[PDB]
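Appendix B. Extra example for self-study. Work through it before the problem class; the solution is given directly after the inputs so you can check yourself.
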Amino acid sequence: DNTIHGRIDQVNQLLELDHQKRGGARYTALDKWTNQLNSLNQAVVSKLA
Amino acid sequence: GSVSVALHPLVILNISDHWIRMRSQEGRPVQVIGALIGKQEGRNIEVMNSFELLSHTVEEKIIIDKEYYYTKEEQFKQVFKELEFLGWYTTGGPPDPSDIHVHKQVCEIIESPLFLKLNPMTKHTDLPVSVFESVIDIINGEATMLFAELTYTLATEEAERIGVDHVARMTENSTVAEHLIAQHSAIKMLHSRVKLILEYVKASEAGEVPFNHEILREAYALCHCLPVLSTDKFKTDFYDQCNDVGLMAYLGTITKTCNTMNQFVNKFNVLYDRQ
Amino acid sequence: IIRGNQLQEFAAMLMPHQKATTADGSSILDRAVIEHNLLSASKLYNNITFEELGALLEIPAAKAEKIASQMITEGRMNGFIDQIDGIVHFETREALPTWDKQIQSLCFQVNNLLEKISQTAPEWTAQAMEAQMA
Amino acid sequence: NMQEAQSIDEIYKYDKKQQQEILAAKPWTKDHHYFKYCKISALALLKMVMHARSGGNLAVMGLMLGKVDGETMIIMDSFALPVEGTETRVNAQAAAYEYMAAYIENAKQVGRLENAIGWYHSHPGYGCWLSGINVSTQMLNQQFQEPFVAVVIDPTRTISAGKVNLGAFRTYPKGYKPTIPLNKIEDFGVHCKQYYALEVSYFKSSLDRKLLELLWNKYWVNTLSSSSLLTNADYTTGQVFDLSEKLEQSEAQLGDKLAKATRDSCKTTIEAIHGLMSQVIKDKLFNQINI
Amino acid sequence: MLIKVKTLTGKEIEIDIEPTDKVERIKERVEEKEGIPPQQQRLIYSGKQMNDEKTAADYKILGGSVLHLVLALRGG
Amino acid sequence: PEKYNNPAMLHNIDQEMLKCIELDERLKAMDQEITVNPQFVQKS
Amino acid sequence: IEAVYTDIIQGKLDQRNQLLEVDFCIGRDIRKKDINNIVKTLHEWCDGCEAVLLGIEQQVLRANQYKENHNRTQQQVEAEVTNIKKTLKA
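Solution. Structure tokens for the complete assembly:
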């Protein structure tokens, strides 16, 4: 129900919380550049020669 | 230091802008004359703002347009109510007879005006701004008003300091030089401080100065506090930062070589091969 | 880290109502002193085990963990608690800000030493400065 | 290296003939979005800021002097007005106009060759936007004085956050439209479709830079150790996010924007390389001594 | 016969007036020239406001003299 | 396999940069050569 | 912790890694023999600062000369294209 941010460990009956996920948003935005730039050169090379 | 003069970080920038405007307008730098306004609280004369004046020339002497002074006074008595005349400023090196000729006319306005100096051809590390007062000395015959140096401070208020910080942060010869010269000057004078400390330690060892047993202990602690944070975690974090910035630079060199490539393709698509 | 074997003087001069227990197995003064000790330990430590924490706060054992859990979720002290290893983390630094704070300390030390040496022997410092700037 | 007019001081020239030709040709009459760039002198910003703070929470404003070069408004001075105003509403009944033309006449003799290029207004703590009547003010200011721009300043936001809250705005003529959205109306006015903002940049003189570099630094752990390249992490994330849309619009155009996009990306990459260089020089200074 | 009018921005226009006219008269004629709003004009000469109701008897423009116009502004 | 934090990765990134830079320089030189041909300058 | 309470040192105790982390420590007594050591360390720091300054100067000079060379190359190609444009109109 998205009320507890964590996961359950069954082999050791643990409850691992989510005191994690530092400010890595940068990385995803960085990935965004790739997903554009590749396509960009794909358009540049496809002009002709 | 006789009377006490408090100086705000506003008149200096106005003088600099006036001189720059004059130099751009006429090419050859000449003398610029302004008027000081502020608050005279007892012996403490606080100079907040200054306004330029139009000064004419007759024969070989500069005369202040006194009617222009009255009109300007009536003008700023409405925007700055409790501000009175304090003196005049000038640009140049050592005082010259022209400055005395201007100040003798200025004295007819206010009994004891101030004298401000700002060297634009300065080649030294000192502050070009200086403060002087006219004093009638014991010179034989008609004793002239000699300009005696005064003790001036850098009193400022919150808005002035914050604006100065904003301007200092803001900023040709390539941006890398701009980013590098600020580091260079800071390291230069930090090294000068270090050299002074080492010189005192050497002098204390030589016995020229009396042997003080308090400074040497703090110096020893400082000596023991050079190798800061040589742990492996710091090294790992620093190398992570370096790699991240390197890949940033890669992604951004590639997008510019793409621009160059597109420009080349567009140029080539019309010369050797039509359509 | 004020302890319970030099606090009897304060307990002596306590009004009956201010001293009356809350019926939780401990006095209110024992509540206050334990909470203050736990907060004080939260500053000059980085991470501590329950076995060691069972000496600063006296305490049997797990009740210290209960008090630590009570301290959190009330906007008083920061830090998460492990239970598999029985180790509580107060707060950790992340290297680079520690480097900046060390720069803070070192350069302030340099500046203060310069001010002290200039105030000690003005003539020699003036001579050295005027010779260096030449 | 002060006698020569470098590329920095070359903007400090008032060519009467060029300005007359620009004002006679009037290239702005056809293109509505003709003006994009707004260059402002340092001292104008200084005088504006000190006038805004001197009045406290009461709104103050004034007329600015400058010229127009192609699509760029170059402003060289600011000026204060003798007005009475409250937090939100001002009048400028007669005193402003008795000290506006007189100031121009006085400045014609000192050496100020510039004329009216726009006005700046201080909005104390309620955003940088054109009010419902201010948009009409710029309407009738532009209808007859075409070289013109409205400057809006927030004193409280600047004094609290630490960044200059400056906005240069020009409005579209009545009839030029290109249901209201819920994201472009809180940072702008209800008439946001009737006006647009212009890119704002500042310039200074060579002697200004020289005096600034010798004014006062200290700044060892204030500038030389200040978590650089990290303090503006949110700024860099926002920039690298909106470059994605910029590049996608450029690619759609290809299927020019591309040069602007490349310049925008180059700015960020250069800034963060400068941050890396600062970190490297710090490491070489402090860490690697007394092995 | 060759009176001139100048704006605070730099515009310089030429008009012709009769000695016996009123200030309102020269107003209408200058809007017939261009089309300015009549109630948003401030007239200046020698740093003084020009009273509209006064028929021009002593406000001397004898050759080359230039009037100044100001556009009304409000920033509430 | 890798954590991407060792100086070897930085050296590899530097090596890739020194090849991209050479490629960009070659394209710029070729474009500059093209923009001088007398056959050009007249088609625009 | 009793030692820390007297403001002698500012440190953090670690129980997981068993590593005391000190930040500031007050200097103890110094004999008349360690002055050579502090002189040597200060001289080394001065030499490092001088080397850093020289490197900074060299790098900024290289950047300036590279920018100048690129600008001269652009000016030369512009002069060539203007010359050929002038020649073409015959």
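Self-check: The helical segments of chain C are 8-12, 16-19, 28-41, 50-56, 62-71, 96-120, 122-132. If your reasoning did not lead you there, revisit section 3.
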